[PDB]
Structure formats: C-alpha cells, structure tokens
Amino acid sequence: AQHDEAQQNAFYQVLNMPNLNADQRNGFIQSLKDDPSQSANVLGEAQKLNDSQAPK
C-alpha cells in the first residue's frame, strides 16, 4: 500500500492458491518472509506447485 507492490502481490498470490495445502503455502510465505528479494522466485515456485496440483 505504502509501496512494495511486487512484495505484497507475491504474498497475496501465495495465499490465494487453492490447490496448495496449508504446509505448502505457509512454507512459501516463510520463504518469502526470509528472502524478500526472492518474491518472484517464491511466487513462481508456489504457482508451479499450485498448477501441478490442479484438479482439472
């Protein structure tokens, strides 16, 4: 809101991934928190894991 659009976007996206489970999405959130630089990477990995676990 103040700024950091990529940072907050990545966080919101990782939350809003319904094909992940709790352990996975929380894992990615903690990875994001630890490595704020790696917003794009964490987002990519999370999106890939969500996509691969999609029901179809």
PDB file of N, CA, C and O in Angstrom, residues 2 17 22 28 32 48:
ATOM      1  N   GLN A   2       1.754   1.361   0.993  1.00  0.00           N
ATOM      2  CA  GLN A   2       2.807   2.366   1.068  1.00  0.00           C
ATOM      3  C   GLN A   2       3.748   2.291  -0.140  1.00  0.00           C
ATOM      4  O   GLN A   2       4.313   3.303  -0.549  1.00  0.00           O
ATOM      5  N   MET A  17      -3.948 -19.405  -3.579  1.00  0.00           N
ATOM      6  CA  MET A  17      -3.606 -20.560  -4.401  1.00  0.00           C
ATOM      7  C   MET A  17      -4.316 -21.773  -3.790  1.00  0.00           C
ATOM      8  O   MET A  17      -3.761 -22.419  -2.901  1.00  0.00           O
ATOM      9  N   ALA A  22      -1.963 -26.376   3.412  1.00  0.00           N
ATOM     10  CA  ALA A  22      -1.526 -25.446   4.441  1.00  0.00           C
ATOM     11  C   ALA A  22       0.000 -25.414   4.538  1.00  0.00           C
ATOM     12  O   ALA A  22       0.598 -24.347   4.426  1.00  0.00           O
ATOM     13  N   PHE A  28       5.917 -21.465   1.664  1.00  0.00           N
ATOM     14  CA  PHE A  28       6.224 -20.416   0.704  1.00  0.00           C
ATOM     15  C   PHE A  28       6.171 -19.028   1.349  1.00  0.00           C
ATOM     16  O   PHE A  28       7.048 -18.216   1.074  1.00  0.00           O
ATOM     17  N   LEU A  32       9.234 -16.425   1.555  1.00  0.00           N
ATOM     18  CA  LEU A  32       9.056 -15.040   1.132  1.00  0.00           C
ATOM     19  C   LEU A  32       9.556 -14.089   2.224  1.00  0.00           C
ATOM     20  O   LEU A  32      10.321 -13.168   1.951  1.00  0.00           O
ATOM     21  N   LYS A  48       3.753 -22.812  -9.675  1.00  0.00           N
ATOM     22  CA  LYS A  48       4.049 -24.086 -10.312  1.00  0.00           C
ATOM     23  C   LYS A  48       3.465 -25.241  -9.494  1.00  0.00           C
ATOM     24  O   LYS A  48       2.831 -26.132 -10.057  1.00  0.00           O
TER      25      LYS A  48
END
